């Protein structure tokens, strides 16, 4: 395949043109996003039951919905969570391989079977099935300071939202806020003045605000002679607050007509009143633009910003827009980094080729054949249906090194032949290709073998490995192809003959460098001859080095992905149980004035009455958004340092409640998180106090008796708060004339909201809700003095029936797989790994009698399955590499000479990581580098490069010995021949990965991890192999 194309340069150029065109057409049809989708399909229900507690909501809605979901094909597990706010969710997680759309369609079809059995209110509001997965893109914020949050929410929903949905690439826009509604604030004192009731208001509003369908004149079964037809029209709906206030509640025989304004006050309000957002202290209304699968992120951000700048000319006075956070600047920075590394790699390879080969027409072949390799890689990526994302671009950055090593190898061999034998370019190229073609094919096979297993993993880490695996493997295959077709023809046609005796005559810097490198090579071959002289000593030294490397490797922490400074910090306020929204707002204002002081924080968003750890009136959370990294270049100006400073200030000044700032993980869905999440269930429905007692007994068993860093272990629910319970004595309630329908009516009307009807508000329908005035809803006496009408119409005090009283109760419920559950957390301190810790906790839960079980949660479900897949895949890859090398060398013994250079790279990488951790623990803050995904990728890369170098050395030494030399002579001459290209490749690749070694800014955590691994692996492994591979060959040939 090489001699065919050395004689057909135009044919080679045509195939490269086709590859270039395919790569460009692939680049132009690839979705651009920040991350791929790694989490598994999840669907949620989100029912609404206003006024219901955790127990009522759960038992009457969520359990009923959930016990109809077993059997939805693909169900992994199932969860349920209700709180005291009137909203609950069922969350079904499906196994991978499942279709999110078919899953959601099946969940909806199952819900339809039981929708009738739920309460009438839950049916009025409706249950909303939806997929959890989100492709978040941007956040929009409208701040006014002059108009309420209701007017801003309405303006947004009517004018700004329906125009962002229309932009190309937008897959969904969500407005965070309650819509408008006609609110009626009844006064019970005035109601009892006239002897009316809440049912009167509800029925009157439902009877006087109704839609009329009149019909038509001249309908189809008509009389002979009808000439005209016409649709009749009537308007029976109310539209304003005055018309609603004019509703008639009772028409007297006298004609007085008491109205709805007599007993209430009617105005436009909101639906819930629960949450309240603020940006830097001023009111805001936020949206959430989300990208669509197969959409470009940068184009969509640009279009959204332009559309908003156009719309801003019609904003009311005082309003303004702002996009504080945007997840397209990440992929934009990644693309810019790819381009910059490509250009600097071109410069480095130019410098190296000119310094060593000492001519300019040598530095034009790599410049031509590397971009074509990357373009073919882009083409393959596009074919397989992937996207352009942070991980794909890191893969390109990594593969650039191998793709330049290929060209360096080929051109250096050709130039060596041309200079040593004074041959023309065609003959020299033919000879060089005859020498290196089989080796190139074998190297490509070995690289494919070692990169395949990265794509055959399972879980979310499997999806993260697939990116690197596929990108790098495709790029490497295309590089090998281009090395066998286009590089030989380019060398044959561009290179010029070297006059016999041309070299050794240079008079300048070039002659000095030539002499210097000649002396260095002589010294190197002398040292390798010495190393080969004594074999047992060097072999025992090698065994020691390999065992020490394995040791340093095993004694290395584990992780998934390091936390990165993505620009923002999250905050979670929490007040004592029973607090109100006013104290929470005061505490949030304190937090805002604190975050204003920190000069690294630019914006701060504040949300009240909501938190990821439950939703309650005494909860809240903020979002501190930091400046651009360009301004945050200092010791204490990264995300973690800002989090620490903010937590310190909070603990210092916060009067009511506490708050903690944290830097979230990179992958929000399935990203590295720490801890052994647990879900303690009870199979026998023993109760809540019993399950709580068992949870506390387990926490006690774990805290001190076990080995779990007793500080970290914690309960993960929501502490019980005092409640107000009303026993109803049915015996005494029946001694008098009080029934049980009126008791329920009074109790449910005194304190909760009521959805009665809808009305048309300037184009769109909205809800009409009745509820008491605030002054009748505040003290516990507003429920104890609730008189109920007996059978004779008269009122009766509810103290003679109920006997209200205080008690401590649960403010949150949770089910897991159909059983009441209670979450727990923990972490093994050090030296104990997750395996034996989880076995210990399982035995602990076993100690607790039957009726109580442990179910793993979150990432522990992935960590529960043994890590045997990794070992199996790596052993199979090693066997495949051995088989390929045996096919290449035609021996069963020689492959052992190349399989002995894996310990070297492993030792190098592990020692570099450990040394960086020491050097940054002595002078730095904390050990930041561990054995994570990026370590695995960089280690596989260094292993591939070292295997390539060793393959070439061994294949050169095997041919020389065949010519009639010894084994020592063959190894010596092979080392002396391979010395220069190894040095060139090492120089280039190491100086290219150096910019990853000091990465600072966007995503520099993974960049620093991979840079450290690759740098130290390459350096140490090369320094060792350069001397040991000849020895491996010698001992493997003398042993057999």
């Amino acid at each position: 395949m090489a001699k065919f194309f050395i004689d057909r340069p135009i044919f080679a150029w045509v195939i490269s043109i086709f590859i270039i065109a395919a790569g460009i057409f692939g680049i132009k049809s690839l979705p651009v996003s920040q991350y791929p989708s790694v989490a598994a399909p999840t669907i949620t229900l989100h029912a609404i039951y206003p006024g219901a507690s955790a127990q009522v909501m759960e038992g009457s809605v969520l359990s009923v919905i959930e016990r109809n979901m077993n059997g939805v094909e693909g169900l992994d597990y199932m969860s349920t969570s209700a709180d005291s706010s009137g909203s609950g969710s069922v969350s079904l997680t499906f196994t991978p391989d499942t279709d999110e759309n078919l899953a959601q369609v099946e969940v909806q079809n199952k819900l339809s079977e039981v929708l009738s059995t739920l309460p009438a209110t839950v049916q009025q509001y409706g249950v909303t099935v939806s997929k959890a997965r989100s492709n978040f893109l941007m956040i929009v914020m409208l701040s006014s300071d002059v108009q309420s949050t209701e007017e801003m929410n309405d303006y947004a929903q009517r004018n700004v939202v329906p125009e962002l949905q229309r932009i190309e690439g937008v897959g969904q826009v969500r407005l965070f806020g309650a819509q408008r509604a006609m609110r009626i604030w009844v006064d019970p004192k005035k109601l009892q003045n006239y002897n009316l009731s809440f049912a009167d208001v509800g029925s009157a509003l439902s009877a006087q605000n109704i839609q009329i369908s009149a019909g038509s004149i001249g309908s189809l079964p008509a009389v002979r002679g009808q000439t005209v037809t016409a649709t009749v029209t009537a308007q029976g709906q109310l539209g304003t607050a005055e018309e609603f206030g004019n509703v008639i509640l009772r028409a007297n025989t006298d004609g007085s007509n008491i109205y709805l304004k007599d007993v209430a006050k009617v105005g436009l309000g909101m639906e819930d009143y629960s949450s309240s957002t603020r940006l830097n202290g001023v009111n805001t209304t936020g949206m959430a633009v989300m990208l669509s699968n197969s959409g470009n992120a940068m184009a969509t951000a640009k279009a959204v910003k332009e559309r908003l700048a156009v719309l801003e000319k019609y904003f009311p006075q005082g309003m303004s827009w702002k996009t504080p956070y945007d997840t397209s600047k990440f992929v934009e920075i990644s693309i810019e980094k790819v381009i910059h590394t490509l250009i600097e790699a071109m410069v480095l390879v130019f410098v190296v080729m000119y310094l060593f080969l000492q001519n300019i027409r040598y530095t034009l072949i790599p410049t031509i054949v590397v971009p074509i390799s990357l373009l073919g890689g882009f083409a393959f990526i596009s074919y397989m249906g992937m996207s352009i994302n942070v991980l794909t671009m890191f893969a390109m950055i990594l593969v650039i090194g191998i793709v330049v090593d290929d060209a360096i190898v080929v051109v250096e061999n050709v130039e060596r032949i041309m200079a040593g034998e004074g041959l023309p370019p065609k003959e020299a190229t033919k000879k060089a290709m005859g020498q290196i073609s089989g080796a190139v094919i074998g190297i490509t096979a070995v690289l494919i073998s070692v990169f395949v297993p990265l794509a055959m993993f399972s879980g979310a880490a499997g999806n993260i490995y697939k990116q690197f695996a596929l990108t790098m493997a495709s790029s490497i295959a295309f590089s090998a192809f281009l090395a066998l077709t286009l590089t030989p023809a380019l060398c044959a046609t561009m290179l010029k003959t070297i006059p016999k005796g041309h070299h050794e005559e240079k008079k300048g810097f070039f002659g000095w460098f030539n002499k210097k490198f000649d002396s260095w090579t002589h010294g190197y071959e002398g040292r390798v001859a010495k190393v080969l002289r004594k074999t047992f000593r060097m072999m025992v030294v090698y065994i020691g080095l390999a065992v020490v490397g394995v040791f340093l490797f095993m004694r290395l922490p584990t992780s998934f992905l390091p936390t990165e400074d993505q620009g923002f910090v999250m905050v979670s306020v929490q007040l004592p149980a029973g607090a109100t929204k006013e104290r929470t707002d005061a505490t949030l204002a304190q937090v805002t004035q604190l975050a204003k002081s920190i000069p690294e924080i630019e914006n701060i968003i504040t949300v009240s009455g909501f938190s990821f750890s439950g939703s309650g009136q005494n909860m809240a959370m903020g979002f501190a958004i930091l400046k651009d990294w360009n301004e945050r270049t200092a010791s204490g100006s990264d995300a973690v340092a800002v989090a620490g400073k903010l937590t310190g200030m909070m603990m210092g000044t916060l009067k009511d409640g506490f708050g903690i700032a944290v830097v979230p993980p990179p992958i929000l869905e399935l990203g590295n998180g720490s801890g052994l999440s647990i879900n303690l269930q009870d199979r026998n429905n023993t109760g809540h106090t019993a399950l709580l007692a068992k949870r506390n007994e387990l926490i006690q068993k774990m805290r001190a008796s076990g080995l779990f860093d007793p500080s970290t272990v914690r309960a993960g629910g929501l502490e019980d708060s005092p409640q107000l319970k009303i026993d109803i004595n049915r015996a005494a309630a029946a001694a008098q004339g009080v029934s049980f329908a009126d008791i329920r009516t009074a109790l449910a009307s005194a304190l909760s909201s009521s959805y009665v009807s809808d009305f048309p508000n300037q184009g769109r329908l909205q809800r009409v809700m009745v509820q008491a005035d605030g002054d009748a809803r505040m003290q516990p006496a507003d429920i104890l003095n609730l008189t109920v009408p007996n059978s004779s119409g008269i009122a009766v005090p509810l103290s003679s029936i109920a006997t209200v009283s205080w008690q401590m109760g649960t403010e949150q419920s949770v089910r897991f797989n159909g059983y009441p559950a209670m979450e727990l957390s923990g972490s093994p301190a050090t030296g104990v790994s997750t395996g034996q810790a989880m076995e210990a906790v399982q035995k602990m839960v076993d100690e607790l009698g039957s009726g109580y079980s442990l179910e793993w949660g979150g990432q522990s479900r992935e960590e529960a399955k043994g890590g045997s897949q990794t070992i199996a895949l790596y052993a199979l890859a090693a066997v495949a590499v051995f088989l390929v090398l045996a096919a290449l060398y035609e021996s069963w013994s020689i492959p052992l000479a190349v399989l002995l250079v894996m310990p070297l790279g492993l030792a190098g990488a592990a020692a570099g990581v450990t040394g960086r951790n020491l050097f940054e623990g002595l002078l730095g803050s904390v050990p930041s580098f561990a054995n994570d995904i990026y370590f695995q990728v960089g280690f596989v890369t260094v292993m591939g490069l070292s295997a390539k170098n060793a393959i070439l050395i061994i294949e050169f030494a095997k041919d020389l010995q065949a010519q009639g030399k010894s084994a020592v002579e063959a190894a010596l001459e092979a080392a002396r021949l391979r010395f220069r290209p190894i040095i060139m490749t090492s120089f280039a690749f190491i100086l290219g990965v150096v910019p990853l070694y000091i990465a600072g800014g966007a995503s520099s955590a993974s960049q620093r991890a991979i840079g450290t691994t690759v740098f130290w692996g390459m350096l140490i492994g090369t320094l060792l192999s350069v001397f040991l591979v000849p020895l491996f060959y010698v001992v493997v040939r003398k042993f057999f």
Binding site: H46, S275, G286
Partner: peptide, 9 residues
């Protein structure tokens, strides 16, 4: 960043 969904914000 309100109404049940936090958002990266």
């Amino acid at each position: 960043c309100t109404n049940e969904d936090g958002k990266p914000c």
